[PDB]
Amino acid sequence: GKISILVLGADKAQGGQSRTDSIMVVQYDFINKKMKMMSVMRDIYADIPGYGKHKINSAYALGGPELLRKTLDKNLGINPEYYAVVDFTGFEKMIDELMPEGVPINVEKDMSKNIGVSLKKGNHRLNGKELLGYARFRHDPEGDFGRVRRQQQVMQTLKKEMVNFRTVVKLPKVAGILRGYVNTNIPDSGIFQTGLSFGIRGEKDVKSLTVPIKNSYEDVNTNTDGSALQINKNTNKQAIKDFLDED
Numbered sequence: 001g002k003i004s005i006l007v008l009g010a011d012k013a014q015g016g017q018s019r020t021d022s023i024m025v026v027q028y029d030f031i032n033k034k035m036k037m038m039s040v041m042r043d044i045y046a047d048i049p050g051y052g053k054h055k056i057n058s059a060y061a062l063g064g065p066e067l068l069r070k071t072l073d074k075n076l077g078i079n080p081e082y083y084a085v086v087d088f089t090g091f092e093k094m095i096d097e098l099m100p101e102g103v104p105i106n107v108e109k110d111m112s113k114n115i116g117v118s119l120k121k122g123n124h125r126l127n128g129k130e131l132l133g134y135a136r137f138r139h140d141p142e143g144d145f146g147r148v149r150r151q152q153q154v155m156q157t158l159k160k161e162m163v164n165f166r167t168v169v170k171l172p173k174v175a176g177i178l179r180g181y182v183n184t185n186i187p188d189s190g191i192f193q194t195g196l197s198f199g200i201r202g203e204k205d206v207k208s209l210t211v212p213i214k215n216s217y218e219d220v221n222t223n224t225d226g227s228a229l230q231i232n233k234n235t236n237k238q239a240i241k242d243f244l245d246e247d
């Protein structure tokens with residue numbers, strides 16, 4: 001009695017090949033009315049069926065959401081039903097259409113390196129370009145680990161700012177905006193049902209999990225992939241199973 005979605009932030013390399021640099025899984029439980037989200041770090045060193053051990057986000061470049069799903073299932077027991085892929089322009093335009101007033105974000109610190117915008121610490125309303133910049137920043141010692149934290153902060157803010165009667169009343173519009181800028185195989189009745197159930201009768205606390213979990217991984221230098229995360233898959237499989245079954 002649940003729905004699960006593989007949510008991908010994607011972009012183009014200079015050579016034009018597509019890449020995913022943010023991997024999340026969202027599950028909504030229709031019975032218990034509980035929503036959960038997990039971030040899967042893109043640098044996890046994973047067995048990609050057919051291709052050997054590589055950074056897990058290479059599965060998407062090779063075989064799209066289907067191969068990334070199979071790779072998540074084999075390596076982490078994560079097997080989402082649906083997918084939703086968004087690129088830079090889609091993300092920016094989606095935010096600006098959903099929230100023209102801007103998204104209220106407690107910006108962790110001043111940041112501007114490599115994100116094409118200049119953000120100031122503290123509570124600010126960010127447009128699509130700025131919120132994307134906030135989700136992309138990584139040029140500090142925390143690297144991808146701090147980016148995952150800030151991406152989860154963005155998702156929690158979008159949650160708090162969009163689940164309300166003013167938006168659930170506007171679910172048809174919201175859904176049309178999403179399908180125009182998000183590449184997804186969810187049936188549109190499913191966007192409606194999830195929004196209706198969660199927006200009216202869902203628990204407001206959305207619990208989150210970051211994979212790999214603390215003290216289960218190290219950074220290793222790889223032959224052709226470079227900097228990657230070598231993780232204890234079995235320890236992470238058990239944490240994921242524990243996280244997803246009991247609120």
Ligand SMILES: CC(=O)N[C@H]1[C@@H](OP(=O)(O)OP(=O)(O)OC/C=C(/C)CC/C=C(/C)CC/C=C(/C)CC/C=C(/C)CC/C=C(/C)CC/C=C(/C)CC/C=C(/C)CCC=C(C)C)O[C@H](CO)[C@@H](O)[C@@H]1O
Binds near residue numbers: 020
């Ligand atoms: C910034 C930097 O330092 N860059 C340097 C660095 O490169 P890099 O690390 O790879 O980053 P890039 O620049 O390549 O950008 C790519 C980086 C990233 C993080 C890709 C980001 C792409 C995006 C589209 C942003 C993703 C944003 C977030 C918040 C993560 C979550 C993803 C998405 C798509 C959020 C989606 C939200 C929605 C409302 C749409 C959902 C649509 C649906 C149909 C599903 C709806 C149902 C649900 C249940 C949703 C969940 C529920 C709620 C309430 C939110 O290193 C190089 C060499 O060293 C340097 O050249 C370079 O300068």
